[PDB]
Write a protein that binds this ligand. Structure first.
Ligand SMILES: O=C(O)c1cccc(CNCCCCNCc2cc(=O)[nH]c(=O)[nH]2)c1
Length: 222
């Protein structure tokens, strides 16, 4: 099924809310007249890869990729055989310098991280083909805020990775006495040298995980 049951159990209170029904209607109408990404079965891939209770790390994105075959419901990720986009190449580049033993998988599919409890959540979960931010402020933001809010209140010692000002705003209210928040610039080439290169978020995450008595992410398990 398209929406993981452990996530549904905790998020179902949102579904009957006025904003959510409206959002579903909006997306449905868009799909009738336009090509909308990701495909219908991949809007909620981020609920399918692990149990909600097993989340260890949260990487917040903004808008899904807007080109053919790119977005598949995990932020920054692209399925085989799609080449990693520039943002993702920069992520892999930082991994290579942050963690010597990291190995580039030769593809852009981040499912391996998702399975380990890395939540790869975009704030806005659909986009009209070729039109960045086309589905902005139509209700997704309230829903993904609800996901972040649940994790904030109902988990312990998560590491939140906030890349770029948009993600920083979205994670502004995270409880920093209960969770860890790491912030830097967005990995896109335009912003990557404003802090992302050298941020060392991946090793830092693993050390923070070990501080909470948790097993680290194998970032090369892709
Ligand atoms: O114009 C600017 O000032 C500017 C500069 C640097 C980054 C940004 C933020 N937008 C970059 C948009 C391209 C990434 N797309 C990759 C991506 C994929 C995904 O799934 N989620 C996400 O947030 N991003 C904006």
């Amino acid at each position: 099924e398209f929406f993981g049951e452990s996530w549904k159990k905790h998020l179902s209170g949102e579904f009957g809310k006025p904003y959510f029904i409206k959002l579903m209607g909006f997306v449905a109408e868009e799909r009738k007249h336009y090509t909308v990404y990701p495909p219908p079965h991949q809007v909620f891939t981020w609920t399918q890869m692990c149990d909600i209770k097993d989340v260890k790390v949260v990487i917040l994105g903004q808008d899904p990729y807007h080109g053919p075959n790119q977005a598949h419901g995990l932020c920054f990720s692209v399925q085989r055989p799609v080449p990693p986009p520039p943002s993702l190449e920069n992520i892999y580049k930082e991994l290579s310098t942050d963690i010597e033993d990291f190995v580039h998988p030769g593809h852009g599919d981040l499912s391996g991280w998702a399975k380990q409890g890395v939540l790869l959540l975009n704030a806005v979960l659909t986009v009209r083909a070729h039109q960045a931010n086309s589905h902005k402020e139509r209700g997704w933001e309230q829903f993904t805020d609800a996901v972040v809010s649940w994790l904030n209140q109902n988990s312990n010692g998560l590491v939140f990775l906030l890349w770029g000002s948009y993600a920083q705003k979205k994670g502004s209210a995270i409880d920093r006495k209960r969770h860890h928040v790491l912030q830097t610039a967005h990995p896109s080439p335009l912003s990557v040298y404003r802090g992302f290169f050298g941020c060392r978020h991946f090793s830092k995450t693993n050390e923070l995980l070990q501080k909470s008595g948790k097993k680290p992410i194998d970032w090369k398990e892709l």
